[PDB]
Amino acid sequence: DMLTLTRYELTQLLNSMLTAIKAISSAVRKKKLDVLSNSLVINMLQSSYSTCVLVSEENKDAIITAKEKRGKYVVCFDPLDASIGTIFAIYEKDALQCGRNIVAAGYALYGSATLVALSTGQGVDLFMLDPALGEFVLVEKDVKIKKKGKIYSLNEGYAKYFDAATTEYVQKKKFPEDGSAPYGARYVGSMVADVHRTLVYGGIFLYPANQKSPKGKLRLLYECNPVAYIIEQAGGLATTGTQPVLDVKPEAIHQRVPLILGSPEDVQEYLTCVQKN
Amino acid sequence: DMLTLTRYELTQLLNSMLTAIKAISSAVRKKKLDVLSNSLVINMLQSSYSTCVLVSEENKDAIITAKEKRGKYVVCFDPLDASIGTIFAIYEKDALQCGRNIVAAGYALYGSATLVALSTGQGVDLFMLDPALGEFVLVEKDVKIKKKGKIYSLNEGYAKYFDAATTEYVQKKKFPEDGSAPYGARYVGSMVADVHRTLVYGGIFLYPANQKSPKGKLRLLYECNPVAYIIEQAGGLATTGTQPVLDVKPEAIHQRVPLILGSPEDVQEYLTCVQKN
Amino acid sequence: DMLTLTRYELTQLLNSMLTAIKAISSAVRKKKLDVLSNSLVINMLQSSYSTCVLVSEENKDAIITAKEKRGKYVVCFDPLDASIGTIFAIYEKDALQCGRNIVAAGYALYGSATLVALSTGQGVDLFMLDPALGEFVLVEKDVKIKKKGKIYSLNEGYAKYFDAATTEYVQKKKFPEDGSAPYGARYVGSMVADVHRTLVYGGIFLYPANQKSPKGKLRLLYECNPVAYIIEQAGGLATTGTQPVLDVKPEAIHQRVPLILGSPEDVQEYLTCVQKN
Amino acid sequence: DMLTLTRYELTQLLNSMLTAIKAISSAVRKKKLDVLSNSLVINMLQSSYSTCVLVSEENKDAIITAKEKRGKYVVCFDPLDASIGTIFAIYEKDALQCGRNIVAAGYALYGSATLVALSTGQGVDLFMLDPALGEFVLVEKDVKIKKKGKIYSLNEGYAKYFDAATTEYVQKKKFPEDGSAPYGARYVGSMVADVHRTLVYGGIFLYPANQKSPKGKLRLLYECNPVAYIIEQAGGLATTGTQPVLDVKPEAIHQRVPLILGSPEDVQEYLTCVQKN
């Protein structure tokens, strides 16, 4: 029952992102939150003396920071996503980058504990906020996702709007010809929560195109790219159905794309259902 | 930014249940938990000088308490159910009672905040644990569930095992002939979490009979009856598909039953799909 | 084990002071603090849209706030005072007011619990910070100090520098001619902590003139006046040895005065030792 | 803002003592406490399967534990000592040992943070309770006390009852013939708090014999011996005025002794004032 604590440009920027995430967590323990969480990030990011361009889910246009505070990196984030979360990728022209230029990204999930999944390009680490210390404690290094899972995760209430491939794929999960058990279904309906289950327990998560939202719903710059980056770094795949999420070339900051991600073999089975349609 | 706090046999028993729930919450903030949470309840219930018979999800046989500590009430509970929870109904012969003899019941959900839904027969109150005070704060009196919702909630991965009625019902939710929007689907896969969403946001939750578990999975005495009691007290319905959960006559302490509950009109539409099969 | 919470220009200003005190408490749970605590107050006070002039223990000159945010009240404070604290009185010409013009004042003591003693002119209330809620909970209304105590409190290590009256008075406390027990001595050496013991348990507290500091040490505007106001509102006295602290006319913002306060009969015995010298 | 945590018979016993201290801390954050804290220690010590004999400040007679749980060590403790604390020394015949047979001892101080000073014979470590983790974090290894300080600490309100040596010594602190500054005086009046200041900042602390309590007040087995052990391990001295505290041979479990401890040169100056009287 005794412990020692040890510490573990870009670096200051992530400190401030983590600090904002600390702030956000406590406000949640208690729509007025969107505004509040948004301003926490921006300000804490602005005053980390290390950003030039910011993209928020909450702001129509990108937020260019004052030259005195200006820095090198660009940050696209969703300040606030039942367990909700925060999403960010560190990279206006300078904000429309393809996901494969990400230097750092992560998310936070605000449950009983505040967890942060984080990667700077050499894997994924999981942190648990220690609110007494006001510091993030490493709980798992280099998290790897299962090659294949036994869970599938989408809003099946959109069945009537599904494209052929999604319909075929869900059919296979429920009626495996093979004579393997059907997958279990889980869908919390908060993307950080569903993605995070997928990372940790394995399987696949889907918010694809459908009749209602033919480009999908989830946002490229600060939802899909970020979790795509985390998932790939964890040994998984993230696709739109036609190309890896991280390879999309953004043509607007608030652009939407389809998101399919998870265990690589599960995503690869989904892609087989696409080629064949 | 200034507040005053005010207070708000059976009564001591619920105090101790709440205290055990306090204890359990903190252990969770951190399988070894099942054993630990179980023993917390039992002991705190035993030493409330007010129980005679206990039924735990964790113990094969009922736990008869020593005469010096013995009391009037009987407690059936699930110490530990991603947001997990604790479930209990206050009522061995004396433990096999039909749900309609419940004097008190509730659950706890351990998320960012520990919430307790509680009823003693005159409605449902929602409490939020204040871990600084070690006390439960009332956040909503007499919670009522929507007459009808727009959410349905089950493991659709069991489709291949569904009975005709469940299959028909899910079909209607996704393809409303009517020309109303399809319901949204949510399934966390933890029963306290799914039930609680259902209470608060409305709709229906299902873990019915299927080929695999023809009696269902969920346990009558300390899962289904308790949440059935909470849901009815909130203006909803809870059925097995053939009779209200609370009217089942238990023929074993660890008996399983099907559970369908939620907004009353949603449960009543499900029941229509049964009569017709 | 169940509770209900109830709420309990000038008003927004105190909210923000309390919020800054919330912020300060958490930073303490962990010299770099002086700067940090100071800036928290100023900013949170500035952006309460209700101040015009501020005086900090940390700033040589008074801090005039921008007209867009400007308001009616003036605040003199010590952001940071072993249990330390925060001190403030709500009232540059406009900052040099005699203590009897105070509209509101209080202190915070950062121990196991963060306590705030607060008065707006109709007594003293004691609050305990609930860090989960981020709100202050009333624990005692209209605190009254004992008419007479059994504790005296000063740095007796300054004996060699004491004036005649202080020496005579300490002699009486230790060798009561009367044949009453000697007072007990307590001296934490943090003024908020010593004052607060004095308020609650009774007795007297002294930091008088001496050879070293002939004007005393403690600061008029944001140490002595504030606690003088709290103590008088609690039925006590606060004197410099020649006039009530609150009646001094400040001739500089960082002016020092002698402070003697406590139970009124104890302060009145001290004053008798002065007249007679 | 990122950290890794690392771990750091006798050993299980100290775990349980620390656990009881965890429990006690939280009850304090909120006379009924004496009983509660006492029972926490005893039970957590009893069920560490490692004690045979216990001595509490709260129990007239020693508490012999049941053979099934019995173990090797004997524990003398004060469950509860404004910042209060817990004191314990690990060693009925088997309970009357001279302090120099101590295998382990420490104290806890319950302030803004719960600190534990701990020694197993190879120095003193300081720990800070992390209440989120429920674990104690090392903040300083092998704490050493100053050779000489500038603080003296006793209830000078007992002056009329002082023996010649104490009176002479206090005179020297206030009127240093030498032409060095007088010591500062601090006296919180809680022994854990006063001792702890003394360890960390340096100087001397005294609760000697006087006319009222000619054997002193503080208790040998679970107040004086424990802090004497901590202080010596930190490079200081602890004396009764005639022999080191740890060398006293107890003739009763609730025996009292005089306590003088601190920086070794300060204690040695006090002892010079004794030989000379």
Ligand SMILES: O=P(O)(O)OC[C@H]1O[C@](O)(COP(=O)(O)O)[C@@H](O)[C@@H]1O
């Ligand atoms: O349409 P659904 O199935 O309810 O999906 C909800 C999705 O929208 C979100 O709530 C976020 O919405 P936005 O894309 O507008 O930010 C995700 O958390 C989640 O995956």
Ligand SMILES: O=P(O)(O)OC[C@H]1O[C@](O)(COP(=O)(O)O)[C@@H](O)[C@@H]1O
């Ligand atoms: O079979 P599924 O869809 O995974 O359902 C899981 C169900 O089992 C539970 O996890 C509890 O299981 P038990 O009935 O064995 O206690 C519920 O929380 C949940 O509703």
Ligand SMILES: O=P(O)(O)OC[C@H]1O[C@](O)(COP(=O)(O)O)[C@@H](O)[C@@H]1O
């Ligand atoms: O000279 P002493 O006896 O050490 O007194 C210390 C005093 O100084 C303080 O620490 C604050 O000092 P300042 O007046 O400079 O702010 C008070 O808390 C305390 O009463």
Ligand SMILES: O=P(O)(O)OC[C@H]1O[C@](O)(COP(=O)(O)O)[C@@H](O)[C@@H]1O
């Ligand atoms: O007589 P004083 O000066 O008030 O001393 C109080 C002393 O008594 C204590 O409060 C504890 O008393 P006990 O010895 O009876 O346990 C110590 O913390 C403190 O040193």
